[PDB]
Design a protein around this nucleic acid. Structure first.
Ligand SMILES: Nc1nc2c(ncn2[C@@H]2O[C@H](COP(=O)(O)OP(=O)(O)OP(=O)(O)O)[C@@H](O)[C@H]2O)c(=O)[nH]1
Lengths: 171, 75, 82, 69, 855
RNA sequence: CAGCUUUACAGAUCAAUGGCGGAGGGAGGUCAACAUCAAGAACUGUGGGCGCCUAUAGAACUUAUAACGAACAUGGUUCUUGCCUUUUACCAGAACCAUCCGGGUGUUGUCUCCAUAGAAACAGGUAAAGCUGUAUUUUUU
């Protein structure tokens, strides 16, 4: 439609693809691309159907490549994650010593596999070649497909010479 | 704190023996009773008396002494 | 705003020298300065115009009656001017 | 614009060095942005007190050197 | 001498201001603010420090292209592999910088970047101790969490000046996408919260205390700063302060050059919203959205800052960042705010008193300096020392104390009221901070913070240092106390190394850990089982990494993580029994309120007691508590007032001390008790020393007996549990909480202007074991939990100890009553008291426990 | 509304001194050939150009980390699983080399569009562009 995806429809579907002859690319060699905003936005919108990757970095807690590596080199897993050959020889033979007895320690936590990779150096003993994973902050966000913009939708409500741009703009 | 303006006001309210010193003039002083108040140090002071300083008394009427040449007040 | 004022402010802490209209030089730690050069100073000596010197604790001076202020030569370097 | 920071010297006896090579003493009671001084009275420097309390104009002050530490 | 110095200088980033000037300034106090930048986890305090660093320096070495552009942060004070790999700033890896103000009064500032994450309060505590001012930093969105409140509380105690940094405005503009009005409201709410948290001082954007920031993009402003940059043009100088004042709060401004009537007509949006927030919003929009040329034009007109040719070809987030940097200049405003905050030096004396008792200083005759924290800045050890008084030159021959020995020293001094210097040190190299280098200097001075290379051999953890020249000087001197590492440790990691050949190495490393990470009680128990009380899990992990890679470099086993348990009674005692080889004692558990008070002059003491727990006058008289544990000792028989045998208490309480240190059941410390002497059957023949010795055992025994009588219990601790979950995921969280044994939701608070439900809780530290991970997996990248122990709150392990029936399964976790005993037994086993695979617990003495309590 | 520089200029004398260089292009192309490749470049060396830039080459230390390439396939030796036994051909994991498929960077050429002086300024005048600007106690009534 001419309304929504106005900036692309003339060029989007073409061989090279198009935006090939302009200031928006290097040239016909077609190595470096540049864009304005609206077109980019349109493209993004078009994509969404395909590439809805949820990019709250926290979403990938224990699904970062480092985490996977750790899992691999601990012979440890995550229900959804993958599993491998054990990377070192599986040679336990603990021998229930003065330390790590049944009647010395208190099996209060189950100590699942999930933990062992999240804290490689604590829960796993002898972490050979195990990279330090991340630990990030929480996301507050709003992503919508409505007419109105820049409003509280689903938050919690609080308790209670022109300034330098003054009708240059409406916000 | 007691600001200078406030002090001046108080003095005015009272009507007490005020003895003014002159800026860059040692030998002379004034002695009277504060009647007026200004934004600056300027005031009107009725029943004033010019005094030669001890290194007596001299005749003088009602006067406004200008704020720029004031130094001391006491009341 | 005045750059000399700024300089004076910076000199706070340092041992500034300070002559007045009277011609009575002081030298002391600059305690506080204001836009009008209303200086306070600590541990301050006080030379008379004639010659004789007198030690004194915490002098205040009103910039109106100040003539010139000598600041230490370290402040030449930085970081006020640019 | 800024207030003269004399809150340290509040309620202490000060040598107000004043215009024409003269002096005043007395305990500090108040002040303003022009550096006028309101003080509970003392002598003019042998010596002789005048007044119960005194007010010194801003222009007149050379210095106000603290007698008390 | 000089060549080496030159070399050192060369291996360093050239600063934009001349470092000579800074050095000169440091020779004078009052031109040195020591600033602890502090806040919650991921506040963006490290980032802020990075901005400052950038401003200071011309070009940084490992500032990549991407970081320059403004993609990744360049957390310049993250330093060590641990931290960059991990995400968290972990140790107090600060920096020193000259900073001009609005009105360019340079001032050499000693910034120390705290860790946010709650299991590193140790570093935060250290920072607080060091720093006379503290920039608290807060996420806009996450809001003033409980953590921040706690910090505020435990910065009032220290004490310190509290500038705030409402950091992450971008998040409310772009993430929350709050309207400007809404944003303003949110800000106001935050401010109110902060004020509430505070006792005395009011904080606001006026009076320079709030510093609005977004470090990602990298702008801080205060309102004064803003005015200076962008509202001197349009207003006469005299009415600038007034304008600033107007700016904040319930104030409106209608078309009137230049009034500004509080309230009001037609179209709202307040002064702050009109003259600040709205402007910011516009800038953001334009930066992202608008035709670039028009934006440029606007910025020429309305800000007089030019978007360069290279900058115009940027991507958005970078471009936006660039724009904001152009607008709000190299962060002077923040510095100005800081300056305004710090009184100065009315507070400083008080702070010093708090650190090291009240008294009077001595400037010329001596120097003294708080050795705050050992570090590993340039690989090798330094001691981050603050010189309070005097000036500490290089090579100088110097006194010291670990503040383990501080109280004792004080006591000795008091008693006194030959020349024995107990330890010593030769100061090799003194340097400054920081981040990625140590600028070396010949002289440390009163006021400023330094790193010192000679110190470390003598001390461990907190330490004082001094250089007296007399008896009088010595008398005058005081000694800084050990730092209330607000959190306290609760979390056992029991170590074996894998090849016990290499135990020496481990020991060496362990000492380093103790020194380096200061929040770690390293007990080396008699069996061979080393034990490490970490603050918590992440901290422990970090420590392990440090040990298991750098300092030890050895394969090292670890236990499923435990706690400390402490001894306490439920009911009162019933029958005192003196033991022989002759005194008897009995204990009641003290009132909860009293305990709480303790956790946070005789007549005075009595009065206090009366105020707290409604103790009588006799009770007041009796009292004599100890250890900061706490337990309370009471000399309350009848004959004691006649008796001078009960007098000479100073001897008697030694046993009590021992008892408190290691209780009966756990062999692990007592807590929440009022001990009471009932009878003291002393014989006629004295032999005073012998008697004292006897008492020292006997008292402990008596205490144990009392505990046994009073229906004793292990006290587990409870982690207070912040969780910042997404609103609709709270049910999941609740379910999770339910699933484990100890767990409780004390409230669910709505973080205004966000989708976050800040749900404070409690969880016992053995139930913790990775709880954060569990929370994060379940909740799908939402609800960043934290666990912590600021309070020192313990609880009943739910059930009766001393029951051989107990439990069924060896391998599994046991039911709650059963667990009440199980832990105790396990603890005993660990200690090396019970001997065998199966055993029991019982208390002598005596007479077969009084014939099993008369059947 | 004042001033200074910078272009267009008029007609200068004409130094004069500056600056402008005594003139060498700007683009791009699925055009090549050639080197040199994480960015770094600290610190040193040795150039041009002024306690300092710009080029070079030399290690240091960086982190690499996620992305010379938001890409990922294939070989070989060795070690270990496992097919098993045997050949390929493989299962599934390590270590160290190699292989393609792509990539930039400058060096140069070559092929299609855009350009375009051979000098200009002094003394100021005209036009525009850029920065700095009201007396009553602390500055100049
Ligand atoms: N949207 C937004 N993100 C920010 C802002 N400030 C920082 N961040 C991001 O959130 C994280 C916080 O910054 P950090 O510097 O890591 O926080 P920190 O001060 O190191 O936290 P500690 O390590 O606990 O001291 C980083 O990933 C930043 O990129 C902001 O103003 N807005």
């Amino acid at each position: 439609d001419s309304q929504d995806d106005e900036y692309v429809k003339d060029w989007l579907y073409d061989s090279r693809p198009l935006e090939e002859d302009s200031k928006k690319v290097n040239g016909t060699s077609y190595k470096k691309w540049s864009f304005d905003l609206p077109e980019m936005s349109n493209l993004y919108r078009l994509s969404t159907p395909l590439r809805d990757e949820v990019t709250d970095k926290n979403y990938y807690y224990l699904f970062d490549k480092k985490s996977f590596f750790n899992g691999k080199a601990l012979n440890n897993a995550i229900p959804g994650g993958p599993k491998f050959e054990p990377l070192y020889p599986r040679e336990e033979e603990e021998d229930y010593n003065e330390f790590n007895s049944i009647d010395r320690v208190i099996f209060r936590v189950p100590i699942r596999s999930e933990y062992k990779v999240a804290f490689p150096h604590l829960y796993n003993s002898r972490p050979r070649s195990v990279r330090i994973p991340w630990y990030n902050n929480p996301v507050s966000c709003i992503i919508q497909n409505d007419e109105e913009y820049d409003t509280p939708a689903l938050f919690f409500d609080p308790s209670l010479f022109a300034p330098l741009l003054a009708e240059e703009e409406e916000l | 704190m007691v600001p200078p303006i406030n002090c001046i006001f108080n003095f005015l309210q009272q009507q007490t023996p005020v003895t003014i010193w002159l800026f860059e003039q040692i030998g002379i002083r004034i002695k009277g009773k504060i009647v007026g108040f200004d934004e600056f140090m300027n005031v009107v002071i009725d029943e004033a008396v010019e005094i030669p300083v001890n290194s007596k008394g001299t005749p003088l009427g009602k006067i406004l002494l200008k704020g720029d040449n004031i130094t001391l007040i006491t009341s | 705003n005045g750059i000399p004022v700024k300089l004076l402010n910076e000199a706070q802490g340092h041992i500034v020298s300070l002559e007045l209209t009277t011609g009575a030089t002081y030298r002391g730690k600059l305690v506080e300065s204001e836009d009008s050069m209303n200086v306070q100073l600590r541990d301050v000596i006080a030379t008379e115009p004639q010659g004789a010197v007198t030690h004194m604790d915490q002098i205040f001076v009103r910039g109106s009656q100040i003539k010139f202020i000598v600041v230490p030569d370290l402040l030449k370097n930085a970081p006020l001017f640019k | 614009v800024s207030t003269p920071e004399l809150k340290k010297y509040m309620d202490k006896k000060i040598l107000l060095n004043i215009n024409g090579s003269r002096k005043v003493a007395g305990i500090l009671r108040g002040y303003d942005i022009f550096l006028n001084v309101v003080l509970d009275d003392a002598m003019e420097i042998n010596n002789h007190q005048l007044g119960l309390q005194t007010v010194i104009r801003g222009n007149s002050i050379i210095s106000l050197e603290a007698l008390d530490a | 001498e000089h060549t080496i110095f030159t070399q050192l200088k060369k291996n360093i980033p050239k600063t934009r201001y001349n470092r000579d000037y800074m050095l000169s300034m440091a020779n004078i106090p009052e031109r040195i603010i020591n600033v602890g930048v502090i806040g919650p986890l991921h506040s963006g305090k490290t980032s802020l420090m990075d901005l400052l660093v950038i401003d200071s320096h011309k070009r940084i070495p490992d500032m990549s292209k991407n970081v320059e552009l403004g993609w990744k942060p360049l957390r310049y004070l993250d330093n060590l592999k641990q931290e960059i790999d991990r995400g968290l700033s972990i140790k107090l890896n600060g920096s020193t910088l000259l900073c001009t103000d609005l009105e360019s009064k340079s001032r050499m500032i000693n910034f120390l970047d705290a860790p946010g994450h709650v299991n590193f309060m140790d570093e935060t505590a250290v920072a607080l101790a060091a720093s006379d001012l503290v920039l608290i930093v807060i996420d806009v969105v996450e809001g003033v969490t409980f953590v921040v409140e706690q910090l505020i509380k435990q910065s009032i105690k220290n004490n310190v000046a509290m500038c705030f940094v409402i950091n992450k405005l971008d998040r409310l503009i772009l993430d929350l996408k709050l309207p400007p009005m809404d944003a303003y409201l949110k800000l106001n709410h935050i401010i109110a919260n902060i004020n509430s948290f505070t006792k005395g001082n009011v904080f606001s954007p006026i009076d320079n205390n709030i510093i609005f920031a977004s470090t990602k993009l990298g702008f801080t402003f205060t309102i004064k700063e803003f005015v200076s940059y962008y509202y001197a043009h349009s207003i006469p100088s005299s009415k600038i302060d007034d304008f600033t004042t107007r700016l904040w709060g319930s104030v409106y401004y209608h078309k009137g050059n230049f009034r500004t009537k509080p309230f009001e007509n037609v179209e709202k949006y307040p002064t702050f919203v009109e003259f600040i927030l709205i402007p910011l919003y516009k800038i953001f929009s334009y930066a992202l959205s608008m035709e670039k040329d028009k934006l440029k034009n606007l910025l020429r007109s309305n800000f007089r800052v030019n978007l360069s040719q290279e900058a115009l070809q940027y991507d958005p987030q970078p471009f936006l960042k660039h724009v904001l940097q152009l607008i709000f200049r190299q962060q002077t405003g923040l510095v100005d705010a800081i300056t305004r905050c710090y009184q100065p030096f009315e507070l400083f004396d008080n702070k010093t008193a708090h650190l090291s008792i009240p008294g009077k200083s001595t400037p010329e005759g001596t120097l003294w300096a708080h050795v705050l924290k050992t570090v590993d800045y340039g690989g090798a050890e330094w001691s981050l020392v603050r010189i309070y008084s005097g000036l500490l030159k290089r090579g100088d021959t110097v006194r010291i104390l670990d503040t383990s020995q501080s109280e004792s020293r004080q006591k000795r001094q008091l008693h006194d009221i030959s020349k024995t210097e107990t330890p010593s040190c030769e100061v090799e190299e003194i340097g400054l901070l920081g981040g990625r280098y140590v600028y070396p200097v010949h002289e440390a001075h009163k006021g400023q913070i330094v790193l010192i290379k000679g110190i470390s051999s003598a001390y461990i953890k907190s330490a004082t240092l001094y250089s007296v020249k007399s008896k009088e000087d010595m008398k005058q001197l005081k000694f800084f106390k050990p730092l209330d590492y607000i959190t306290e440790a609760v979390f056992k990691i029991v170590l074996q190394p894998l090849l016990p050949r290499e135990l020496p190495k481990l020991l060496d490393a362990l000492n380093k850990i103790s020194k380096y990470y200061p929040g770690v009680i390293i007990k080396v128990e008699e069996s061979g089982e080393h034990v490490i009380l970490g603050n918590g899990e992440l901290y422990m992990d970090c420590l392990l990494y440090d040990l298991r890679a750098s300092y030890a470099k050895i394969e090292i086993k670890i236990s499923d993580p435990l706690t400390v348990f402490s001894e306490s009674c439920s009911n009162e005692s019933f029958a005192s029994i003196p033991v022989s080889n002759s005194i008897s004692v009995a204990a009641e558990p003290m009132d909860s309120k009293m305990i709480q008070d303790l956790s946070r002059p005789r007549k005075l003491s009595k009065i206090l007691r009366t105020e707290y727990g409604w103790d009588s006058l006799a009770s007041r008289n009796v009292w004599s508590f100890y250890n900061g544990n706490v337990l309370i000792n009471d000399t309350l028989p009848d004959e004691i007032s006649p008796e001078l045998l009960s007098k000479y208490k100073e001897q008697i309480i030694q046993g009590f001390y021992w008892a408190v240190k290691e209780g009966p059941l756990a062999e692990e410390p007592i807590y929440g008790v009022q001990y009471k002497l009932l009878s003291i059957s002393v014989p006629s023949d004295v032999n005073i020393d012998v008697m004292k010795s006897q008492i020292i055992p006997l008292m402990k025994k008596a205490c144990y007996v009392g505990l046994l009588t009073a229906i004793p219990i292990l006290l587990e601790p409870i982690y207070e549990v912040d969780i910042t979950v997404h609103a609709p995921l709270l049910p999941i969280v609740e379910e999770l909480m339910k699933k484990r044994r100890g767990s409780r939701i004390y409230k669910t608070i709505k973080v205004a202007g966000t989708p976050l439900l800040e749900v404070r809780g409690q969880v016992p530290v053995i139930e913790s074991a990775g709880f954060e991970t569990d929370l994060r997996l379940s909740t799908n990248g939402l609800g960043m939990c934290q666990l912590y122990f600021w309070h020192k709150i313990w609880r009943k392990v739910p059930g009766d100890v001393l029951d051989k029936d107990a439990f069924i399964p060896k391998l599994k976790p046991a039911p709650i009553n059963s667990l009440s005993r199980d832990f105790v037994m396990k603890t005993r086993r660990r200690k090396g008291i019970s001997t065998g695979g199966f055993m029991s617990n019982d208390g002598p003495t005596l007479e077969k426990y009084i014939s099993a309590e008369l059947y």
